[PDB]
Amino acid sequence: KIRLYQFLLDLLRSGDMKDSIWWVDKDKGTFQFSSKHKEALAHRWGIQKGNRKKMTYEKMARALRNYGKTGEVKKVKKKLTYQFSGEVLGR
DNA sequence: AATAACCGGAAGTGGG
DNA sequence: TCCCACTTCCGGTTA
Ligand code: NA
Ligand code: NA
């Protein structure tokens, strides 16, 4: 099953949910969620995963924070903004 | 207060 | 057995 960071990177590449997520500076790997439309993207993540409960942005971001230590995704000090690692961007 | 973004410990679920 | 990669729940902080 796909990993959350890859789900997000794939969305950014495909542009299929452009109103929910977008690059801030794609060269740096920085991206930002929509305040008003992030839940639709979270819902899609849960359905793609086959999870028992409805996925929420709160729970999705709880998972995102766990990447801080290993480094795949880090929180940026900007509203709803995160950053992929160079390794994630390359791989 | 109402709303929103952000936080993480702890325990549960999946598939190795 | 016991870690993976989250998920779910809860209580919380800051603006
Ligand atoms: Na929020
Ligand atoms: Na603010």
Per-residue 3-state assignment (H helix, E strand, C coil) for A19-53:
CCEEEEECCCCEEEECCCCHHHHHHHHHHHHCCCC
The answer to whether residues A80 and A38 touch, using CB atoms and an 8 Å cutoff, is yes
According to DSSP, the β-strands at A21-25 and A73-75 are: unpaired
Q: Ligand 2 centre and the CA of A49: distance in Å? A: 32
Look up the protein residue whose alpha carbon has the minimum distance to the C1' of B15.
A1
Please give the method by which this entry was determined.
X-ray
Both tokens assigned to A34: 């929509």
Among the listed residues A72, A44, A71, A76, the one whose alpha carbon sits nearest the alpha carbon of residue A60: A44
Look up the protein residue whose alpha carbon has the minimum distance to the C1' of B9.
A62
Whether the CB of A74 is less than 7 Å away from nucleic strand B comes out as no
DSSP character at residue A18? T
Letter string b/e over residues A13-28, b meaning 16 or more CB atoms within 10 A of that residue's CB: eeeebeebbeeeeeee
Which ligand has its closest atom nearest to the C-alpha of A79?
Answer: 2
How many C-beta atoms surround the C-beta of residue A69 within 10 A?
A: 8
Q: Determine the Cα–Cα distance for residues A24 and A3; give it in Å rounded to an integer.
A: 22
Q: Is A49 annotated as a binding residue?
A: yes
Q: Is A13 annotated as a binding residue?
A: no
